[PDB]
Nucleic acid binder design. Structure first.
Ligand code: 1N7
Ligand code: ZN
Ligand code: ZN
Lengths: 49, 48, 49, 146, 215, 48, 83, 50, 110
DNA sequence: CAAAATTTTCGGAAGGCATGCTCTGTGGC
DNA sequence: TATTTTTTTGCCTTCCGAAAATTTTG
RNA sequence: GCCACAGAGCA
């Protein structure tokens, strides 16, 4: 039964967070060119790296 | 170089104030930590 | 040289869909969260969710 | 008559003194009166917190709500030991609280966050959103992924 | 009576402390020794002979500091008043508005006790060149800017705002937004279009600066 | 928006109903040759 | 008028993974449409591997136009970028 | 636990092997009815999709 | 009030009447109970549970003081046990609890 | 001042919404 | 034609009298 | 062939 809630929550989160990207001035912006974060995480470091 | 909110240089006597925090503080903290690690190794060598 | 090279390659690459990555990194751990009943620091009557 | 409240806050269900490992005592309560608790004499108002986030938003502001979101999500992830990087949590907290208020990841929240029509239509309430867009004659720039 | 008198005295004294800290944080000239006024001096100076809160005596006026008027050339003196009436009536609120308009005060802080009526609430837009701000004594018991959750908010001047917009190359509608009637925005007296710089402390990196614009 | 001719309130009241193309409401062939089932939109259009 | 001059370039000098992928895809698509190659291909027939060999010693004639959010762009030669 | 010789090298295995009869059931799920591949084929009349 | 009419065992209700004096009247049958000079009361005894004395035990092996108890008209005890406690903010004076050794009646001064 | 118009609050009813893909068989016009 | 059961649970906003509260007239 | 219904597979 937990799969239904997990799938709906993931769908909501991705529909809310898909438009964001890291631009070439190191500022995270939405699709409408509005800033969410000036620097990603306060330091601009990838969690993958 | 640290610039204030107006856009000019910051004096040495108030470099660590909260109102002058820039986007380069992460790099400065990384360099300070790297220097502190190297200084710890040098301190161990000097102590022995 | 090694430390500086690691630092420069740890920065977030421009163009990254960091919002989708964060949405997945939050949604996916919800699948592996099995049931557990927790208590607030030695009080067996609070049962915080 | 015997169900009226003569003393105490009207929304606090109960209160317990908890003796921690350090031996210091903290008063932890169930309820929704953060402002009245941190205004009560004998309670340090500069260190009183709540797991509820809209209560913190109403009392302290939007940045405190962002910190509450990040701390609560991190605590929930760390209790199960899932080891999620905190930068994703910070991104979620910033996305929830960059329009001046705590929106929430719902149909109602996305109806305020996103001004695009086709993205909202593809999620929930397709016909209502499309007819509202037609009536208000709004222009939808093709810039989003969806 | 201890409960009726001493608790009210301590409550209103803490409210006065918070109002002093607020006015000092806006750039107005209040000396440091005035903020840490003890309860005994407060009783000896602002209370009655037989022990009653004299809210009419404790209203005062504040003038801008030289550094503040250097950064903000348009800042003017404010008048802060405490209403003795338990519920704010139109007559007292109209009297406050008339006093602010007649004395040519740039802004006024109105501290009410229990509740404010909607008709009296409509009079804060009444003065065109001056802004009237309303506060509750129950909301001023403890300072919210001293909370561990609330980070440091610093109001930026027009020159600093233009420098920020030039640095990041953006228009003012692209910044993150902060509502007015937000508690911190009410504390700082933010106007529409004013940019606030927020110093955030994260355990991952340290101290980093974010920016918000008042809407 | 009243700057365009289509921006009037009377546009939002049904006077002319656009009958959709049959390529979006096709008649579904069945196993029986003489009879072909029709989409609900076409039947509703005939009722209108 | 939107072109930032070469002296005042402020973006990173390192090639991102997306730039590498797009460059390889573009060169493979060009080779699949009978474009000349600048490498000594050793019997390779797939355009993708030829493009990989071309990127290996920086023999590819393309530039990356990095668009800043304001509108100004920034031209970077592929051979100049560090991979 | 029996002692088994490996059929590849011939040598004795360095651990005793748990060896004996177990009842096994063959289920109806066989790969001959699960494998599928399309490439280009029929399309729906309405959406013109596979 | 939960009372029932003796004639028909139906609920009795209190009516003001034309005279302005309340009567236990029955709306089913002609029955009234006058209550002039008679006090009718129904008591709901609320349950009382045991509570621990939160200040109890704090006056043992403590210093004494010479403070007159507030009930001076009933007794004239002077020696009383006293101790300090902080139940308020740190910027306001520590409160003082006193217990008279003869009459009890524990009081907090300030 | 108390009638009377006006504004705000507070309940209850009414819609909307709830994991992914995949495979068969049966029935009815 | 008129006897006549439910077959998830939780959450959410909009609407709308009703009632409480406040302002406004006479 | 369309439409529902029913069962089944993988976490
Ligand atoms: C459900 C509950 C009443 C229960 C009977 C009411 C009464 C007290 C109410 C909260 C307080 O108002 C503070 C706060 C105001 C914000 O605006 C929205 C959130 C908060 C947390 C409220 C939520 C909710 O509305 C509460 C808990
Ligand atoms: Zn009777
Ligand atoms: Zn005594």
């Amino acid at each position: 039964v937990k799969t239904a809630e997990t799938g709906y929550m993931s769908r909501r989160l991705m529909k809310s967070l898909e438009d964001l990207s890291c631009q070439y001035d190191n500022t995270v912006r939405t699709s409408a060119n509005g800033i969410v974060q000036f620097t990603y995480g306060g330091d601009g470091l990838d969690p993958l790296e | 170089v640290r610039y204030d909110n107006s856009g000019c240089l910051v004096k040495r006597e108030d470099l660590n104030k909260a109102e002058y925090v820039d986007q380069y503080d992460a790099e400065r903290d990384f360099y300070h930590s790297l220097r502190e690690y190297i200084n710890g190794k040098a301190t161990a060598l000097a102590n022995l | 040289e090694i430390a500086l090279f690691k630092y420069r390659k740890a920065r977030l690459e421009p163009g990254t869909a960091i919002g989708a990555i964060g949405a997945q990194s939050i949604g996916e751990p919800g699948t592996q969260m099995t049931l557990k009943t927790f208590h607030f620091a030695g009080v067996a009557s609070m049962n915080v969710t | 008559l015997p169900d009226v409240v003569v003393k105490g806050l009207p929304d606090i269900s109960r209160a317990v003194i908890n003796i921690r490992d350090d031996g210091k005592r903290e008063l932890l309560v169930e309820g929704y009166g953060l402002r009245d608790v941190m205004c009560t004499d004998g309670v340090i108002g500069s260190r009183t917190t709540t797991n509820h986030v809209l209560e913190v938003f109403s009392v302290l502001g939007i940045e405190a709500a962002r910190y509450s979101i990040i701390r609560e999500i991190n605590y929930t992830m760390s209790n199960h030991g899932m080891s999620v990087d905190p930068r994703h949590i910070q991104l979620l907290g910033d996305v929830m609280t960059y329009k001046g208020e705590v929106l929430g990841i719902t149909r109602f929240g996305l109806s305020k966050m996103r001004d695009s029509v086709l993205q909202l239509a593809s999620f929930e309430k397709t016909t209502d959103h499309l007819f509202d867009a037609a009536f208000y004659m709004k222009k939808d720039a093709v810039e989003g992924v969806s | 009576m201890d409960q009726e008198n001493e608790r009210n005295i301590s409550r209103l004294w803490r409210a006065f402390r918070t109002v002093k800290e607020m006015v000092k944080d806006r750039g107005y000239f209040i000396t440091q020794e005035e903020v840490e006024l003890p309860l005994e001096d407060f009783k000896a100076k602002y209370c009655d002979s037989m022990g009653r809160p004299q809210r009419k005596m404790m209203s005062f006026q504040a003038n801008p500091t030289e550094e503040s008027i250097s950064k903000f050339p348009d800042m003017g003196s404010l008048w802060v008043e405490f209403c003795d009436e338990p519920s704010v009536g139109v007559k007292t609120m109209k009297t406050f508005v008339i006093h602010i308009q007649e004395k040519n005060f740039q802004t006024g802080i109105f501290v009410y006790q229990n509740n404010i009526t909607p008709s009296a609430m409509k009079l804060v837009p009444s003065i065109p060149p001056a802004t009237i701000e309303t506060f509750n004594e129950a909301a001023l018991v403890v300072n919210i800017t001293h909370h561990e959750l609330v980070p440091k908010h610093i109001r930026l001047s027009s020159d600093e705002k233009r420098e920020l917009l030039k640095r990041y190359r953006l228009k003012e509608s692209q910044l993150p937004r902060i509502q007015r009637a937000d508690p911190v925005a009410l504390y700082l007296g933010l106007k529409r279009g004013e940019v606030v710089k927020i110093i955030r402390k994260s355990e991952t990196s340290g101290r980093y600066a974010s920016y918000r614009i008042c809407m | 928006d009243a700057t365009v001719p289509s921006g009037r309130p009377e546009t939002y009241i049904w006077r002319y109903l656009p009958a959709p193309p049959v390529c979006i409401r096709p008649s579904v062939m069945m196993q029986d040759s003489p009879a072909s089932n029709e989409d609900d939109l076409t039947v509703k259009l005939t009722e209108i | 008028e939107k072109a930032i001059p070469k002296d005042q370039r402020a973006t990173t000098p390192y090639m991102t993974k997306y730039e590498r992928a797009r460059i390889l895809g573009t060169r493979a698509l060009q080779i699949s449409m009978n474009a000349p190659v600048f490498v000594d291909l050793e019997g390779e027939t797939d355009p993708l591997r030829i493009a990989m060999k071309e990127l290996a010693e920086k023999k590819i004639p393309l530039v990356i136009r990095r668009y800043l959010p304001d509108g100004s762009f920034e031209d970077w030669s592929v051979e100049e970028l560090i991979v | 636990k029996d002692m088994l010789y490996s059929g590849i090298t011939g040598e004795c295995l360095q651990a005793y092997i748990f060896f004996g009869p177990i009842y096994y059931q063959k289920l109806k799920h066989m790969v001959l009815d699960k494998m599928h591949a399309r490439a280009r084929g029929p399309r729906a009349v309405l959406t013109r999709q596979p | 009030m939960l009372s029932f009419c003796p004639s028909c065992n139906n609920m009795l209700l209190i009516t003001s009447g034309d005279s302005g004096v309340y009567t236990l009247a029955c709306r089913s049958c002609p029955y009234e109970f006058p209550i002039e000079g008679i006090e009718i009361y129904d008591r709901k005894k609320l349950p009382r549970k045991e509570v621990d004395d939160v200040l109890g035990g704090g006056w043992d092996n403590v210093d004494q003081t010479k403070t007159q108890c507030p009930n001076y008209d009933t007794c004239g005890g002077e020696s009383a046990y006293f101790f300090q406690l902080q139940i308020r903010s740190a910027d306001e004076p520590m409160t003082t609890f006193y217990k008279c050794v003869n009459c009890g009646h524990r009081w907090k001064e300030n």
